[PDB]
Design a protein around this nucleic acid. Structure first.
Lengths: 195, 104, 303, 49, 46
DNA sequence: GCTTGACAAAAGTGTTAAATTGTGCTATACT
DNA sequence: CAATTTAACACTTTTGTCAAGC
């Protein structure tokens, strides 16, 4: 950088990825992979074919690939992650409104830390923390050992509400409890007609 | 087995648009150029600045200059250095440091 | 744990000796003065010579770089303090990161004329920064700092008194040491209780979580929801049994027509009669309705 | 600061890497601030001198 | 309603996320300890 | 069927005494 | 410690009320 900084640009972190994909041309990669497949006698054919599926998937439908980097994240409505006071005044709260809290904290500190111009050794660690917090918010455990918070149990992420046995894609198809219904033991009625 | 409640309560009233509260809409513009609308009651007293959806404290379009909303200035690193060093001492510090770089 | 990357990265800068700290602080101060000189002198022109301009800009850059280096070499101090306060509710690496923000303040205020080491001063700032951070961010339901301090004082006193007595004290025993009423400490204990996790499993198996079986007190009860409407009709039928002359006063008095109750005077805005006469009309209608001929029609809706 | 959506980093396959052509365990160092990467080289500008 | 013809799922850009929202969460607090009210700019802001 | 005089209880209006909340700073040395 | 919010209180204005009698 000191010797030659005017003729090259480098970066690190997700900002580098965003800058890399900003001016990335989708058509060139698709054509290169297609040509490699056409020259199939090379063993690279398999890897090129594997890549071409995703590359064409992004090449089609018009939608840009920059959606993989987030400049903003949504917040689920409160009542889907409610805070409820049980009988006796004890409060119960979902895990989500804690995960979001972390993302709100580390973000704000970053927005503070940048303002005073702290050294890169601190700002980059803050950025790493922010990205890790977001990753834990979306899919806790995809990084490695998941966050636990209180007790020694993992906190449920957003994905965990759609992934496991409990969720709106597994538990929803198992039916619902209904009103205007009852249950009772049976005895034999021999005098009854079939209907 | 155990029961609880949300932070609020429900209301059973029924009426619909047949009752109209007189309202008018104010217009705001933010720093980045986005524009927004806010319906207020005809009691008005509309504020000069409003926190819009995007999070920028936008300003009203009707007035040429909004409420000044003046605030005290921030405290910075020099301003706190000046609370412990006199300008006379800083002059001597500058002279002392200029002596070394001048040596070469 | 993946905090090891930070420990490695901060490990590439060596510690300062006693004589380097003063040099760095003095360089920072000189660079700040140089920057302020270049900023101020522009307000009235006063061109400086090119050599002096370049030398002063170099002084500015050297001061900034010395400040950065002083922060870099002292980042190692913050972790040794953060490791003490870990486990109280906030993350270890968050503790380190926000103690660093007290470290910058310590560098800002530290001076060499006092003849003391940088650590001696920076430790106080780091510790208070970590304390404030934990106080603000350690709980899902935020507790202001003074409340956190009084809660900590209660916990400290209760621990010793339990160690002595061998059992959990009654509120008055803690009050005798807090110099506040027993109900006050009982309220502080209520403020101290943390919320439980709504997603915790219930039933000794992974069948369901606690939230799946909370009965909502403020539910939309069907029988009431319809019942009210019936009353809102039945009452009308009774009011419609009167003459419009009588009915309007009641409909305006209690706000049935538009939902806003009206004072005796305001009803005269359309009726014209004085407030006392409106009261008399209200009394007449009020006595007519309460007569059994119309009471029985809707009496049992009160429950 | 921008943050990558984890679904496409740790996709198995990593759709992000397959798109922008970097292998897994390399984007991992890129994403989490463990290795620098050059985003632009001015070939014409450097060739000029 | 109920005239649905198809349901499609696709990538969401920052613009769509910013369009869905009614405002951003600027502070981490949720509810006040004393009055048990949602806080001014917290995760439970009204 | 209703106005007017006159009165007391209830409730707005503002001051301010008290309670609560936010914030900077503690200089042996400690990495 | 300063700043902010809550409440405790005195006064003013309004709301509700009784009787004369028109």
């Amino acid at each position: 950088q000191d010797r030659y900084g005017e003729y090259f640009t480098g970066a690190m972190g997700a900002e580098s990825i965003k800058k890399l994909i900003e001016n990335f041309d989708i058509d060139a990669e698709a054509e290169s992979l297609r040509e490699v497949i056409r020259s199939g006698k090379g063993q690279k054919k398999l890897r090129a074919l594997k890549r071409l599926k995703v590359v064409a998937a992004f090449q089609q439908s018009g939608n840009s690939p920059m959606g993989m980097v987030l400049d903003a994240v949504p917040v689920i409505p409160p009542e889907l992650r409610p805070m409820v006071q049980l009988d006796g005044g004890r409060f119960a709260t979902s895990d989500l409104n804690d995960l979001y809290r972390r993302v709100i904290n580390r973000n704000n500190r970053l927005k503070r830390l940048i303002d005073l111009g702290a050294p890169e050794i601190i700002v980059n660690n803050e950025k790493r923390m922010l990205q890790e917090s977001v990753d834990a918010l979306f899919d806790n455990g995809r990084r490695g050992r998941p966050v636990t918070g209180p007790g020694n149990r993992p906190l449920k992420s957003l994905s965990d509400l759609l992934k496991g046995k409990q969720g709106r894609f597994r538990q929803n198809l198992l039916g619902k409890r209904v009103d205007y219904s009852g249950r009772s033991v049976i005895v034999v009625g021999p005098q009854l007609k079939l209907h | 087995v155990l029961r609880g409640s949300r932070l609020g309560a429900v209301s059973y009233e029924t009426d619909r648009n047949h009752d109209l509260a007189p309202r008018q809409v104010a217009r705001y513009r933010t720093d980045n150029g986005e524009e927004f609308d806010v319906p207020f009651a005809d009691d008005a007293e509309i504020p000069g600045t409003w926190l819009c959806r995007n999070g920028l404290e936008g300003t009203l379009i009707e007035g040429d200059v909004p409420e000044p909303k003046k605030v005290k200035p921030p405290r910075t690193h020099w301003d706190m250095l000046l609370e412990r060093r006199s300008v006379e001492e800083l002059e001597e510090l500058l002279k002392e440091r200029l002596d070394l770089i001048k040596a070469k | 744990d993946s905090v090891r990357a930070y420990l490695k990265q901060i490990g590439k800068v060596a510690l300062l000796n006693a004589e380097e700290e003063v040099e760095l602080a003095k360089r920072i101060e000189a660079g700040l003065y140089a920057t302020q000189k270049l900023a101020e002198l522009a307000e009235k022109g006063e061109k400086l010579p090119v050599q002096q301009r370049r030398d002063m800009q170099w002084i500015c850059r050297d001061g900034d770089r010395a400040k950065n280096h002083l922060l870099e070499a002292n980042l190692r101090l913050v972790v040794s303090l953060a490791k003490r306060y870990t486990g109280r509710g906030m993350a270890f690496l968050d503790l380190i990161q926000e103690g660093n923000l007290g470290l910058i303040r310590a560098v800002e205020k530290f001076d060499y004329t006092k003849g003391y080491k940088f650590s001696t001063y920076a430790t106080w700032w780091i510790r208070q920064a970590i304390t404030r951070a934990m106080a603000d961010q350690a709980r899902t339901i935020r507790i202001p700092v003074h409340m956190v301090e009084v809660i900590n004082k209660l916990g400290r006193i209760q621990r010793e008194l339990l160690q002595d007595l061998g059992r959990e004290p009654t509120p008055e025993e803690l009050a005798k040491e807090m110099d506040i009423t027993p109900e006050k400490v009982l309220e502080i204990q209520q403020y101290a209780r943390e919320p439980i996790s709504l997603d915790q499993t219930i039933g000794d198996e992974g069948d369901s979580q606690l939230g799946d079986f909370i009965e909502d007190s403020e539910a939309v009860v069907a029988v009431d929801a319809v019942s009210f409407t019936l009353l809102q009709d039945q009452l009308q039928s009774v009011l419609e049994t009167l003459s419009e002359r009588e009915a309007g006063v009641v409909r305006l008095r209690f706000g049935l027509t538009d939902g806003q109750p009206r004072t005796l005077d305001e009803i005269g805005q359309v009726y014209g009669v004085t407030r006392e006469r409106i009261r008399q009309i209200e009394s007449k209608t009020m006595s007519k309705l309460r007569h059994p001929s119309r009471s029985q029609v809707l009496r049992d809706y009160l429950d | 600061a921008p943050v990558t959506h984890i679904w496409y980093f740790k996709g198995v396959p990593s759709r992000l890497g397959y798109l922008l052509d970097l292998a897994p365990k390399d984007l991992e160092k890129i994403i989490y601030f463990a290795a620098y990467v050059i985003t632009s080289v001015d070939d014409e500008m450097r060739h000029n001198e | 309603v109920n005239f649905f013809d198809e349901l499609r799922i696709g990538l969401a850009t920052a613009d769509d996320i910013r369009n869905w929202s009614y405002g951003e969460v600027k502070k981490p607090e949720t509810i006040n300890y004393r009055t048990l009210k949602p806080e001014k700019d917290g995760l439970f802001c009204e």
